[PDB]
Design an enzyme around this catalytic site. Structure first.
Site, PDB file in Angstrom:
ATOM      1  N   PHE A  25      46.658  42.620  29.108  1.00 22.40           N
ATOM      2  CA  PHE A  25      47.302  42.355  30.388  1.00 22.40           C
ATOM      3  C   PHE A  25      47.127  40.921  30.856  1.00 22.40           C
ATOM      4  N   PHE A  73      45.679  32.139  36.001  1.00 20.97           N
ATOM      5  CA  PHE A  73      45.974  33.327  35.218  1.00 20.97           C
ATOM      6  C   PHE A  73      46.774  32.944  33.977  1.00 20.97           C
ATOM      7  N   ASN A 120      47.053  35.055  43.600  1.00 25.91           N
ATOM      8  CA  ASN A 120      46.568  34.995  44.967  1.00 25.91           C
ATOM      9  C   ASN A 120      46.296  36.395  45.486  1.00 25.91           C
ATOM     10  N   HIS A 131      52.903  36.415  42.150  1.00 22.18           N
ATOM     11  CA  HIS A 131      52.306  35.231  41.551  1.00 22.18           C
ATOM     12  C   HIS A 131      53.427  34.377  40.980  1.00 22.18           C
ATOM     13  N   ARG A 190      38.219  37.509  35.068  1.00 23.78           N
ATOM     14  CA  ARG A 190      38.926  38.763  34.831  1.00 23.78           C
ATOM     15  C   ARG A 190      39.596  38.761  33.466  1.00 23.78           C
ATOM     16  N   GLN A 214      42.161  35.740  33.398  1.00 27.60           N
ATOM     17  CA  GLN A 214      42.148  34.997  34.646  1.00 27.60           C
ATOM     18  C   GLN A 214      40.789  34.359  34.844  1.00 27.60           C
ATOM     19  N   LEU A 238      53.483  41.543  38.276  1.00 23.63           N
ATOM     20  CA  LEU A 238      53.052  40.329  38.959  1.00 23.63           C
ATOM     21  C   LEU A 238      54.214  39.446  39.403  1.00 23.63           C
TER      22      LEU A 238
END
Lengths: 34, 320, 299, 34, 49, 290, 158, 205, 55
Positions: free
Chosen positions: G52, G105, G94, G118, G47, G55, G114
């Site tokens: 942003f 990440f 997660n 996370h 990702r 990941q 987040l």
């Protein structure tokens, strides 16, 4: 974009393909031969 | 260096046929090996016996130079292609044209047949090739993308199925179904007029006045050079035993070893009596089906047949 | 492999195996019954003909020697898998006969559920009716009990009914399903019976000499209904290990008898799955769906 | 006003091919007038 | 981890188990995507099957 | 010629019933922009609504990312000019005859090499939906679009077809109104479309937080706080957006006063939050304090 | 066993991330054991959200793989004051609490969203310009970017 | 440098020099921008400066401009060097086994002849018009979801039926439009051998 | 793509002959690098032909 024009020479003709027969020279015999 | 090349015996001229009235531009052998066929710039197609060298028959339909002939292995058909932009299908049970493929916009320089499916591929000077359907005369694909006349085309059953060399010094490997170029090879500096595929090795070679090059399928990875023949190269032709014949346009013909690329003979034949010496040139060469004879079609209106020399040995003709 | 079969012109409603595990029978709207060979390339040899209405349920005998097939045109049919030819046209049904069941290991006897308001018992040899329990209404599925002495049926009034062949009264009525029951199939235990019903719940019951008087045993979630109200059918595995169901959701639902977990909701179909068939020998699955073809999944 | 391809010169870039972009930012570049 | 399938891969020749077929993807969902760029799309405005 | 699987249309224009029945015609009409023949799909929008038709090529759609008949954007749903401006885009599609046919040919050849999944070009590089765009967006389906036309007969009195008059037998709209004459070609190219200008003026008159005069006024007044918020919650509203220097949660007036550490950070935060910082459901009013 | 700076020299640039065990002992130990374990070689960025997140670290490369050093996954080790307020906060994401596995990440900007879902477990002490470059790259519609950018070397601090 | 772990309280790092070797302070309630971090930048045109699986700069990118990965692009010096394949034996180079060739022939035959059939059925033009295929059913998931649209269903099911063609209807549209031909494909790199020199005397010749 | 009939036999022969000549050397036996003057070798070709005809 396919036309509907047409031609005297695009009529169906000779519509079957002759294949080389058993005695003429079929790819089997020439596969064999010496 | 290299391991050392295999020894091949050298070839000697043993026959000279002369009955054409213009340059002889294409030559082909029947499947069953009884006769061969020549097409010439006097617009005829002559059919000769391969044992005797006698002329069997003369077919006259074209309007200009016949620049390619081929004989189909699956059907009793001979496909010819001329500079009159027309491509013909002669049926050899009546000796008459039964089919003609229309659509090229300038002279057709060469043509090959697919070995399993029934299609034709032709290359022409409008810088396109076309994939014709043998049976319905319909053009199923126009392979475009070259930027100058398309000198030569060869097709195969494996993949990629079509290799074209053109005068804009590029080779392209195409896919038959999709109809577009996968690979473009730009290693040559001058027009690629000759392409050949090894019979049993998934490799191919391409000839140009710079040097012959070898490439490896299916994405054309370079392998090696073959240098020494500095002449406009009109033909390449490979034996099953790794002999590679490179016929030039000033008449000179080199014979090479395919695997190591070692030029083991150089033939410089002589021109027919009434010819000038500026008129020696080889336009096509073809191995027999037994791969014993080598026929060449020349710019002095003769057909020269070479056979291998049987009375020579590694010590008579050593390998340098 | 996935092995999708095609050659049916309209929905296939019913697909089931040879009790050998040798040949395949499928049927549906096209008013004829296609047969295939389960192994090799899953190829088609024979096609049975004759049924004017839609083939709503095909049923084997327990050897595989004669074929039963309930048709929309008021009739059941028994045919010879030997030939494919009609031996008997069970007529006399006063409406749409949807469900058929041949007695297994007993005298040759058949129970048929129909849209007339009766369940009908028939003997193959007499060309006459044996018994008929007109409760009130349409019966949508029917199966015997392994004694060949009770007969279970499921219709529109949600209370699964069982008749005793000798006293001919409503022997056992069971309750708890919220909407119409669409499928019954008694496991090869001779005891555990499986019920699909479009209220989105599947249930398990057990017909015994003695049962807890309220024998609603196991319950699974997942099946769907919609504007189609197609007939949804269930089956046990040869082992009583996995329950297979279809639904109008294009998902083959494979659950287990033990943990009632969702072992599978498999996609692959295009239209509602109407019938899933388990191989009596193998871990082979055949899906009959309303997308006019079948699937041959291997698990 | 009736000419098919005339304004193909003075109104718009006749057949515009914008340069390809490579490994550098051409964004802030802009040029002067006459 | 055991055998999972690529969710964007739809041509699946293996018989997937429940977890082996619908295993959830880990991470956060990109806050930059409108409803249109977030939905699963075969066509420019939506999947159609 | 184009060839499609379905239209690509706004939900407003597609209709109300979940179950629609639609007809296709291969090579049925000529795109009013692409100028080439297309496949034309026709559906009955609803009960007593005009049959609508896809009116622009599938490529002429994917290029500018619009609905093939509704012509409004696909995600937000504003006129093409408005969406372009809100994305700050500069669409360079040619105008003259030969240049436009040539551009269409090559753009189509290049869109042939796509996945059919998202618009080609800057319409992927401009999907950062600005709060102006989200703010102008339509909310529920303006299904007044699909009612029939105005009956020239019933406007002159003549619609003697009883109740079946093929057009809405109501008053004809005064032709002076800017919202009357919007040719398809301009509405696709986005050059002087009146609805775009009216909607842009509406977006300019819409409330947004105002900036102060002095650089030293770095206290920001958030009005309408409520006693379900924490100072740490106001932080989390204005904490990672930069740095906050102080926070005064005025409980005697239900407001807040945030002193920041970066002027641009607080400005972005408060302007981006203007009446729309919805934390625990409270309409806070972000302004610069005294 | 708390490796200070875990060096993950990606193809597209060098990296070494400092994990605060005092705030995040469980995920610091997990990530160190993974980096010294060398299992992260071959993990393609599953990702990339421009400005942003980046990941990656998935043994499938799709997002339905990944395992931890205590099994499949374990719980989160939350911090009260550690957040995603700035780039490079290394927090294993997660799809549900107490199920954080191998996936890694790296923030690229303030990610106060987040926070709480996370566990911010450190910050990347090497290669932040490279992180920005990887964050600028053009990605497909599934955040598996067109470039198969992978780590060359995964190892911890000495 | 960066204050100690647990003793980094009090200081808010504003210039990346306070990062020492780098690092963001998750406990520090400031947006850490360590070594160019945090700040969303202008959208620049520069395409992704990729790097190979060993840390080399993959300039294959700029020649491969706007092209698939099916394209094989020779653009490195190592493509020119003679590979030592002077071997009569290696099974690397031997044609595919005739079974795979049979597969390729069947597939090609199929696609080839079907396109033939359409192109020649064009040359029928008197189309022995067959019936319109049965009405198809397509299930459509809009991208926009919202209870106020589609009256609250997240799907629509649509019935495709193809409209009848009038037998007596001439063509509708003008086919013959002329335009210049498009740009070709991205120019391939010219992999030559280095040029040699022509003396003045040769150019005289 | 009109055929070559009977009024275009000569004009076509000359089209293809001088296309061939231009392929032939003036691009495949050059090393008159700068500008190989092929447009002037074609002039020599036409004049050699007229000189043949005039003996």
């Amino acid at each position: 974009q396919l036309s509907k024009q047409y031609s005297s020479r695009d009529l169906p003709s000779h519509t079957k393909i002759k294949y080389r027969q058993t005695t003429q020279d079929a790819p089997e015999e020439v596969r064999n031969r010496d | 260096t290299m391991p050392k090349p295999q020894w091949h015996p050298p070839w000697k001229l043993y026959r000279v046929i002369s009955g054409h009235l213009g340059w002889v531009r294409c030559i082909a052998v029947e499947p069953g090996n009884q006769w061969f066929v020549t097409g010439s710039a006097d617009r005829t197609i002559k059919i000769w016996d391969l044992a005797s060298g006698k002329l069997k028959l003369s077919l006259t339909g074209h309007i200009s130079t016949v620049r390619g002939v081929i004989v189909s292995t699956r059907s009793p058909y001979l496909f010819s292609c001329g500079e009159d932009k027309q491509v013909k299908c002669w049926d050899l049970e009546y000796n008459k044209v039964i089919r003609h493929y229309h659509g090229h916009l300038s002279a057709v320089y060469g043509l090959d047949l697919h070995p399993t499916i029934d299609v034709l591929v032709t290359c022409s000077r409008d810088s396109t090739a076309r994939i014709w359907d043998v049976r319905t005369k319909a053009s199923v694909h126009t392979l475009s993308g070259h930027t100058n006349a398309v000198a030569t085309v060869r097709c195969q059953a494996a993949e990629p199925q079509i290799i074209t060399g053109s005068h804009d010094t590029t080779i392209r490997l195409w896919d038959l179904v999709a109809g577009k170029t996968r690979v473009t090879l730009t290693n040559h500096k001058k027009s690629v007029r000759a392409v050949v595929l090894h019979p049993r090795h998934y490799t191919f070679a391409s000839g140009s006045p710079d040097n012959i090059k070898q490439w490896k399928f299916p994405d054309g990875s370079f392998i090696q050079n073959l240098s020494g023949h500095n002449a406009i190269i009109n033909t390449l032709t490979v034996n099953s035993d790794g002999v590679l014949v490179s016929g030039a346009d000033n008449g000179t013909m080199h014979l090479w070893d395919w695997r190591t690329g070692y030029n083991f003979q150089r033939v410089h034949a002589a021109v027919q009596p009434g010819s000038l010496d500026s008129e020696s040139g080889i336009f096509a060469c073809a191995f027999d089906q037994s791969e014993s004879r080598l026929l060449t079609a020349e710019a002095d209106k003769t057909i020269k047949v070479y056979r291998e020399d049987d009375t020579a040995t590694e010590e008579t003709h050593p390998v340098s | 492999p996935i092995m999708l079969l095609s050659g049916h012109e309209g929905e296939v409603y019913c697909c089931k195996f040879h009790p050998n595990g040798s040949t395949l029978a499928s049927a549906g709207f096209d008013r004829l019954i296609l047969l295939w060979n389960v192994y090799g390339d899953c190829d088609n040899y024979a096609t049975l003909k004759g049924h004017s209405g839609a083939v709503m349920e095909l049923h084997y005998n327990t050897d595989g020697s004669m074929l039963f097939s309930a048709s929309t045109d008021k009739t059941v049919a028994v045919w010879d898998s030997e030939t494919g030819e009609r031996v008997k046209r069970l007529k006399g049904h006063t409406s749409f006969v949807n469900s058929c069941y041949p007695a297994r290991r007993g005298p040759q006897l058949v129970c048929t559920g129909s849209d007339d308001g009766t369940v009908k018992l028939w003997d193959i040899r007499k060309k006459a009716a044996i018994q008929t329990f007109q409760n009130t209404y349409q019966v949508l599925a029917v199966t015997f009990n392994d004694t060949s002495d009770q007969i279970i049926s499921g219709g529109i009034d949600n209370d699964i009914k069982v008749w005793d062949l000798r006293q001919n009264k409503l022997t056992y009525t069971m309750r708890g399903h919220a909407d119409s029951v669409t499928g019954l199939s008694l496991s090869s235990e001779g005891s555990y019976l499986l019920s699909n019903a479009m209220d989105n719940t599947v249930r398990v019951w057990d017909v015994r000499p003695f049962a807890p008087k309220e024998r609603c045993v196991k319950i699974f979630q997942g099946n769907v209904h919609n504007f189609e109200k197609n007939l949804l059918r269930c089956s046990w595995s040869p082992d009583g290990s996995k329950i297979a169901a279809g639904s109008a959701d294009r998902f083959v639902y494979v659950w287990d008898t033990t943990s009632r977990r969702i072992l599978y909701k498999l996609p692959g179909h295009a239209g509602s799955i109407n019938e899933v068939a388990f191989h009596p020998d193998e871990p082979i699955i055949i899906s009959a769906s309303s997308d006019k073809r079948l699937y041959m999944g291997e698990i | 006003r009736k000419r098919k391809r005339g304004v193909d010169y003075n109104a718009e870039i006749p057949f515009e091919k914008k340069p390809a972009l490579g490994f550098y930012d051409t964004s802030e570049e802009n040029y002067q007038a006459l | 981890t055991g055998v999972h399938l690529d969710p964007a891969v739809k041509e699946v020749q293996y018989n997937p188990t429940y977890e082996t077929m619908f295993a959830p993807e880990f991470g956060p969902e990109n806050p930059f995507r409108t409803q249109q760029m977030a939905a699963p799309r075969n066509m420019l405005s939506g999947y159609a099957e | 010629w184009e060839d499609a699987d379905f239209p690509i249309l706004c939900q407003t224009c597609l209709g109300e019933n979940p179950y629609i029945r639609m007809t296709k015609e291969k090579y049925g009409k000529e795109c009013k922009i692409c100028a080439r023949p297309f496949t034309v799909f026709r559906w009955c929008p609803g009960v007593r609504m005009r049959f609508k038709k896809t009116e622009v090529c599938q490529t002429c759609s994917k290029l500018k990312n619009v609905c093939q008949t509704c012509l409004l954007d696909l995600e937000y749903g504003l006129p093409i000019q408005v969406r372009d401006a809100g994305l700050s885009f500069k669409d360079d599609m040619p105008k003259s005859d030969v240049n436009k046919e040539y551009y269409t040919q090559n753009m189509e050849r290049e869109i042939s090499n796509s996945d059919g999944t998202r618009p080609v070009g800057m319409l992927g590089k401009a999907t950062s939906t600005s709060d102006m765009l989200l703010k102008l967006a339509r909310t529920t389906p303006y299904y007044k679009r699909n009612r029939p036309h105005i009956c020239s007969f019933w406007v002159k009195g003549e619609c003697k077809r009883g109740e079946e008059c093929p057009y809405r037998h109501e008053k004809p709209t005064d032709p002076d109104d800017p919202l009357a004459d919007q040719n398809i070609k301009d509405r696709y190219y986005g050059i002087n479309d009146p609805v775009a200008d009216k909607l842009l003026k509406r977006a300019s008159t819409m409330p947004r937080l105002d900036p102060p005069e002095d650089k030293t006024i770095t206290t920001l007044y958030v009005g309408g706080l409520g006693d379900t918020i924490t100072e740490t919650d106001l932080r989390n509203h204005f904490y990672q957006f930069g740095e906050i220097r102080t926070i005064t949660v005025v409980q005697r007036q239900q407001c807040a006063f945030i002193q920041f550490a970066t002027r641009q950070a607080a400005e972005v935060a408060a302007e981006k939050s203007f009446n729309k910082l919805i934390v625990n459901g409270r309409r806070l009013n972000v302004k610069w304090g005294r | 066993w708390q490796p200070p700076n875990v060096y993950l020299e990606t193809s597209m640039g060098i990296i070494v991330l400092e994990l605060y065990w005092k705030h995040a002992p469980k995920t610091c130990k997990n990530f160190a054991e993974l980096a010294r374990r060398g299992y992260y070689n071959g993990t393609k960025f599953h990702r990339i959200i421009k400005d942003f997140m980046i990941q990656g670290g998935d043994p499938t490369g799709t997002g339905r793989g990944g395992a931890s050093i205590y099994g499949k996954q374990f719980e989160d080790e939350l911090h009260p004051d550690l957040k995603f307020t700035g780039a490079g906060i290394l927090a294993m994401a997660n799809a549900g609490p107490d199920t954080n596995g191998s996936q890694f990440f790296v923030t690229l900007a303030p990610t106060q969203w987040l926070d709480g879902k996370h566990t911010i477990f450190g910050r990347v002490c090497q290669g932040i310009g490279m992180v920005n470059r990887v964050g600028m790259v053009e990605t497909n519609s599934q955040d598996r970017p067109v470039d198969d950018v992978k780590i060359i070397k995964a190892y911890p601090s000495g | 440098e960066p204050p100690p772990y647990g003793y980094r309280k009090g200081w808010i790092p504003r210039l990346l020099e306070d990062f020492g070797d780098g690092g963001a302070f998750p406990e520090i309630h400031v947006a850490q921008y360590p070594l160019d971090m945090g700040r969303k930048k202008k959208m620049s045109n520069a395409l992704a400066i990729q790097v190979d699986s060993e840390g080399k700069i993959k300039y294959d990118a700029i020649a491969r401009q706007g092209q698939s990965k099916d394209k094989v692009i020779y653009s490195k010096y190592t493509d020119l060097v003679p590979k030592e394949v002077m071997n009569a034996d290696d099974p690397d180079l031997q044609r595919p086994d005739e079974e795979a060739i049979k597969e390729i022939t069947e597939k090609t035959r199929v696609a080839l002849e079907k396109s033939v059939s359409q192109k020649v059925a064009a040359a029928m033009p008197v189309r022995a018009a067959d019936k319109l295929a049965p009405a198809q059913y397509i299930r459509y998931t809009p991208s926009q979801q919202g209870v106020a649209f589609n009256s609250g269903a997240k799907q629509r099911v649509i019935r495709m039926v193809e409209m009848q063609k009038d037998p007596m209807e001439p063509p509708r549209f003008k086919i013959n439009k002329k335009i210049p031909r498009g740009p070709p494909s991205p120019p391939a790199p010219v992999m030559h051998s280095p040029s040699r020199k022509m003396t003045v005397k040769e150019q005289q010749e | 793509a009109k055929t070559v009939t009977k009024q275009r036999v000569e004009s076509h022969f000359d089209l293809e002959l001088r296309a061939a000549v231009m392929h032939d050397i003036l691009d495949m036996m050059p090393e008159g690098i700068k500008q190989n003057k092929a447009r002037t070798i074609l002039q020599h070709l036409s004049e050699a032909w007229r000189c043949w005809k005039a003996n």
